[PDB]
C-alpha cells in the first residue's frame, strides 16, 4: 500500500548513468565473497573454476526512505534500473551469473541508503602454474577483483569484515589438491587510463 | 474479450518488484517437483544430471478477482508481469531452463489469489560417490533449494505433502546405479545476508 | 500501404494471453513434421538427433480480414504478437531453435483465419535401448510432444495429413553411421500428470544396425 | 550538413513497416548473394561437419528506402538492421552458427540514393558434410553450403549470385592443413515443399585428403 | 542534480547512427591496446588467445559541453547511445566481449568533444603457421583489425602514441608455456574489398618455441 509508492519515488527521476556522489567524494564499496566450490583445478589448461556468492554493499543517498522500519528486498529486475559498480575479474576466461529459475541477483535496500547487492557467479579463472616440482607443489592461484571504469577518485574497495570477509573456504574438499591457506590483498593498480583499485583473493593449493 | 477485462484489471497498480505480504506475513510457498529423469552419475566431477518439473504455489492477495471464471490458465507470457519468487538450486553447476518453442512456463490463477507456477528444469548437482568401497557404492545425492534474496522472515518454503511430496517416473531414465527411494528435509541455514530456509531432496543410489 | 492498415487493425482488441475461443470450443492444432536430416544416434549418451521443420496450424477467429490477398506471408516478428501453442518435447534434452539472419520461423495468416507456424529445430531426445543383444538389435526411438500449460480441455493436437502420411523424412536426410532408418509409426495419446490429462503425440523411429 | 541527414533518415523510418517485404502483394524482389570466404576452419571426419567463416553479403532493391538530397551512399549504424526488413535466409545444413559479436554485431547497412540496401554479415557456420569414407587416402569430398529463404515462396522473393562466378571470393586464398581446394561451384536451384517452392543457392566445393 | 540535466542536452537532437562528420571531414579514430596476457598458443588448430584492453578515441563535436566537471566518466549504458565504430578483428574466429556485473566498457567524454572508449576483450585469432621447422619454430602471428561498414573515406584508424610504443604487453602477464614472446610489430595497410577500401591496423607478435 504505502510501500509501493515509496519504491516508485525512489525510481522516479533516478539517473542510472551517474554514480552516487557524482562530481564529489568517491563512493565506498565493500565486498564479501562466500566461496562455494573450487570445482575443476585443471593442470593442463592452467585454470580453476570458482563458484562464489559475490556480494557488494555501498552507500547511496538517492535511495533512502523515511518510514517503513524494515529492509526492502526487491526483485532482481531492479538492478538494471539502479547503479551498480562495474566490477570485473582480471583473470577470467568464462563466467556467468546463474539463471536457475530467474537470474540469481539480490537487491536489498535499507532505510539509510546502504544498497546491498548479490550475485551467484561461476568463474573459470586462469592462474600461473609452476610445474617444476610436479608432485606436492603449491600453486597460489588468485582472483583479481577490480573495477573497470572508475578511478580511485571515484570509488574505493575494501573487504567488508576484514579477515572475516571470505567464508566457506574451510568447508571445501578437493580430491587432488588441498586448501592450506587463503589471504586477502588490497592495492591500487595504475594503467595508462587511470588508477584502479584491486582486491586479490589468493588460494595456496598443497597437492596431496 | 471478457477474460481480457479481468486480466488487464489485475495489472494496473501492480508492482512486480514487491512480494505480496511485504510487511505482514512471511509469504509461505508450497512446492513440489516431478522427477522426469535422473541422468548419469559421472562422479569424476561429482555431478549427476536430473530433469524435473519444479512447481510452486503461493497466495497473492493482489491477484484476487471476482468469481467469473473459477481459474484461468495462462501461457508463458504473464510470468514476467507477475511477482515470481526467486529460487536457486544451491548445489547446481548449470541449472538451465528449457526454452524451446515458447518456453516451459505454466501459470494458473484462481479467484482466491492462489498462483500455481511450474518450470521444466534440467540440473546438475553435487554428489560424491563416497569411494571407501568402490564396488560397494552408496550415495545420498542431495538437491536443495532456497531463495537468494528473501530470508526466512520474508519467504517460507513448505512441502505440499508431509515428508514425501515428490513424484517419480518409470525407472528407465539412464541410471547406472540402483535408485532406492526418496527423503526430504527442511533446514534453516545461517548466512551473512540472513537466515534462509533450505529444502533438501535426497536421491538414494547404490552401484550394483 | 494498404496492408499496414490491415495489420494495424488486427491487433486492436487482440490479446496474446488467450487461446482462440476461451470459454468455448477447444483449439485443434494440426501438427506436421518434415524431417530434414535424422542425425547421428549417440549410444553412450543414449540419445539421438533429428532436424525437423516442425509445422503446426490452427484457426483463430480474431485474425480474419477481407483484404485483396488471401494468404499473407508475414515475417517471424509478427508471430510473437499472436497466440502460439506451447508445444514441447517430453523427452527432449537440448533442443536448439535455429536462429540465423532472421529466426527460422514463419507465419502465413489467411483470410479464413487459419494460421501456419513452422519452425526449423534440432531436437535431441532420449532413445533408451536394450544392449542384451548388442551387435545386432532394432529398437524404436520415441519423439513425444504436446502442450505444457493447456490441458485436453483447452488444446487438442491433431495430425495435418493422415497419421501414416504426416511425419515425412527427407530423401537425402540421413546423418546415420551405424543404424538404418527404415520406418516410423505415430499415434495419439493422453499422459495425465499432477495438473491434468495432457494430449501427447508419440512418434517412434524404428531403426536397425548394420 | 548533419541536420539535413537526420531529417531524411527519420523520414525513411517514419511510416516504415518492418513486417512487410518490399512490393508486398506484387512482383518478387530479387536478393543477390555475395560470399567472401574467410577460412575453412575445422573440417572433421568424426562429427561429419566442417566449420566455415565467411562474409555473407546480400543486396536487394527496395522502394521505401530512397532519398534525393544526399549524394552519398549512406552507411548507417548496424542497429538499423534491427529496424529494417532483411531476408530470412538460412543455411539448411548448419549445425551451429553465429554472427560475430567481438565489438559490435558485425553488420553492414549501406543505403543508396537509388534504393539498394546492402547487408553484410561475418558469420561462422558449422555445416554438416556427408563424407564417403570408402577409401581413406583418396577421400575427394564434396561439402556443400545451401543458401535458402525460409518464409518466402519463389513468387515473394528470388535469389541469384551477384556477379555470376565472381560472387564467391577468397576460396583460392585458403590454406588448409590437410586438404586442398581443387574446385568450387555455385548452383542456383528451385526446391518445393508442402509449404511452397523455395529458391536455393548452393555453394559447393571439392576437398582432397593428402 | 545538475549533471542529469546536461546529459539530456547532449543527447536530444543527437542521432545515434550518424558518424561525426557525415559530408564533412573523415572521422579519425585513435586506437591503443594493452595486452593484459598473451594466452597459450594452439598448435593443433593454429590459433592463439589474447585478452586486451582495446582503447579507442575520436572527436564527436556534437558532444561538447560546458560544465563544472572537466571530463565525464560515464557508464557502459551511456555508450550504447553514442555512435561507436565497428572495429572487428580480421583474424578473430571467436571472441568474448567480457561482461561481469556491467559490460566491461568505459566511456569518458571530455569537454572538447573527444572521448575515450575501451573494452576488455578476448580474441581467439588464428596464425597461418609454417611447421616445416617444428622443433625450431619462429612465428609472427597477426592481429589485423579495422572497420566493417565504414570506408577509408569515412573512418581512418590511427595509433595513439608512436606506433612502436602504441602497443603494450603486460610486464608480468603472459600465458605462454611452449613459446616465448620476443616482441611486437605494428603496420598500417589498406585492404581492397569488394565493398570498398578499408584501413587495416596490423599487429604482429614474434614467437619462438622453447
Ligand atoms: C553478458 O552479455 C550477454 C549477451 O548480451 C547476456 O546474455 C543475455 O542476457 C539477457 C538478460 O538475461 C537475456 O535476455 C533475456 O532472455 C530471456 C530468455 O531468452 C532466451 O533466448 C533464447 C531463446 O529465445 C535462449 O537461447 C536463451 O538461453 C540462453 O540464456 C540463458 C540465460 O540463463 C542461458 O542459461 C542459456 O545457456 C543460453 O545461453 C534464453 O533462454 C527472455 O525471456 C528475456 O525477455 C523478457 O524480459 C525482457 C525484460 O524483462 C524483455 O525483453 C521482455 O519483457 C521479455 O519478456 C517477454 O517474454 C516473457 C517470457 O516469459 C514474458 O514473461 C513477458 O511477459 C514478455 O512477454 C530477455 O530477453 C539474453 O537472452 C541473453 N543472451 C544470451 C545469448 O545468453 C548476459 O546475460 C550478460 N551477462 C551479464 C550482464 O552478467
Ligand atoms: C535471434 O536473432 C534475432 C535477430 O533478428 C534477435 O533479435 C534481436 O534481439 C535483440 C536483443 O538481443 C533486440 O534488441 C533489442 O531491441 C529493443 C527495441 O527497442 C531495444 O529496446 C533493446 O534495448 C535493450 O538493450 C540495449 C542494449 O544496447 C540497452 O539500451 C537496454 O538495456 C535495453 O534494455 C534491445 O537492443 C533486437 O531488436 C532483435 N531484433 C529483431 C527482433 O528483429 C534475437 O535476440 C536472437 N535470439 C537469440 C540470440 O536467442
Ligand atoms: C601468494 O599468496 C599470497 C597470499 O596467500 C599473496 O602474497 C601477497 O602478494 C601481494 C601482492 O603481490 C602483497 O600484498 C601486499 O600487502 C601489504 C600489507 O601486507 C600491502 O601494504 C601492499 O600494498 C600489498 O598489497 C603481499 O606480497 C602478499 N600479501 C599477503 C597478505 O600475503 C599472493 O597471492 C602470492 N604471492 C606470491 C609472492 O606469490
Ligand atoms: C557437389 O554435388 C552437387 C550435387 O551432387 C553438385 O551440384 C550440381 O552441379 C551441377 C553443375 O552445375 C548442376 O547441374 C546443372 O545445374 C544448372 C543450374 O542449376 C542447370 O541449369 C543445368 O541444367 C544442370 O542441371 C546440378 O543441378 C547440381 N546438383 C544439385 C543437386 O544442385 C556440385 O557441383 C558438386 N560440387 C562440385 C564442386 O562439383
Ligand atoms: C536491515 O539490515 C540492516 C543492515 O544489516 C540491519 O542492521 C543491523 O542488523 C544486524 C543484525 O540484525 C545487527 O548488527 C544490528 O541489528 C544492525 N546494525 C546496525 C549498525 O544498525 C537491520 O537489523 C535489518 N533490519 C531487520 C528488520 O532485520
Ligand atoms: C555508391 O554506390 C554505387 C552502387 O554500388 C556505386 O556505383 C558503382 O560504382 C562502381 C565503381 O567501383 C561501378 O563499377 C559500378 O558500375 C557502379 N554501379 C552503379 C549502379 O552505378 C557508386 O560508385 C558509389 N559512390 C560513392 C561515392 O561511394
Residue numbers in the entry:
A (entry chain E): 10 to 217
B (entry chain D): 25 to 232
C (entry chain C), E (entry chain A): 12 to 221
D (entry chain B): 8 to 217
Task: Give sentences from the paper.
GABAA receptors are chloride permeable, γ-amino butyric acid (GABA)-gated ion channels that are responsible for the majority of fast inhibitory neurotransmission in the mammalian nervous system. GABAA receptors belong to the pentameric ligand-gated ion channel (pLGIC) superfamily. The large number of subunits gives rise to many possible pentameric assemblies; nevertheless, the most prevalent subunit combination in the vertebrate brain is the tri-heteromeric receptor composed of two α, two β and one γ subunit, with the arrangement of subunits being β-α-β-γ-α, in a clockwise order when viewed from the extracellular space. Here we present methods for the expression and isolation of tri-heteromeric GABAA receptors and the cryo-EM structure of the rat α1β1γ2SEM GABAA receptor in the presence of GABA.
Three dimensional reconstruction, combined with judicious masking of either the Fab constant domains or, alternatively, the receptor transmembrane domain (TMD), allowed for reconstructions at ~3.8 and ~3.1 Å resolution, respectively, based on Fourier shell correlation (FSC) analysis. Inspection of the resulting density maps were consistent with these resolution estimations, and in the case of the density in the extracellular domain (ECD), the quality of the density map is excellent, allowing for visualization of medium and large side chains, as well as glycosylation of Asn side chains. Thus, we propose that the conformation of the ECD represents an agonist/allosteric modulator bound, activated-like state. There are three substantive densities within the neurotransmitter binding sites, at the interface between the β*(+)/α(-), the α(+)/β(-) and the β(+)/α*(-) subunits, an observation that diverges from previous studies suggesting that there are only two canonical GABA binding sites located at the β*(+)/α(-) and β(+)/α*(-) interfaces. The oval-like densities in the two canonical sites are well fit by the chemical structure of GABA, although the density feature at the β(+)/α*(-) interface is weaker than that at the β*(+)/α(-) site. Interestingly, the third feature at the α(+)/β(-) interface, with a sausage-like shape, has the strongest density. In the canonical binding sites, GABA is wedged between the β*(+) and α(-) subunits with extensive interactions with residues from loop C, loop B, loop A, β2 strand and β6 strand. The amino group of GABA likely forms hydrogen bonds with the backbone carbonyl oxygen of Tyr157 (loop B), Glu155 (loop B) and Tyr 97 (loop A) and a cation-π interaction with Tyr205, while the carboxylate group forms possible hydrogen bonds with Thr129 (β6 strand) and Thr202 (loop C) and a salt bridge with Arg66 (β2 strand). There is a well-defined glycosylation site at Asn110 of the α subunit, within the extracellular vestibule of the receptor, at a site of post-translational modification that is distinct from the other GABAA receptor subunits and not observed before in any Cys-loop receptor.
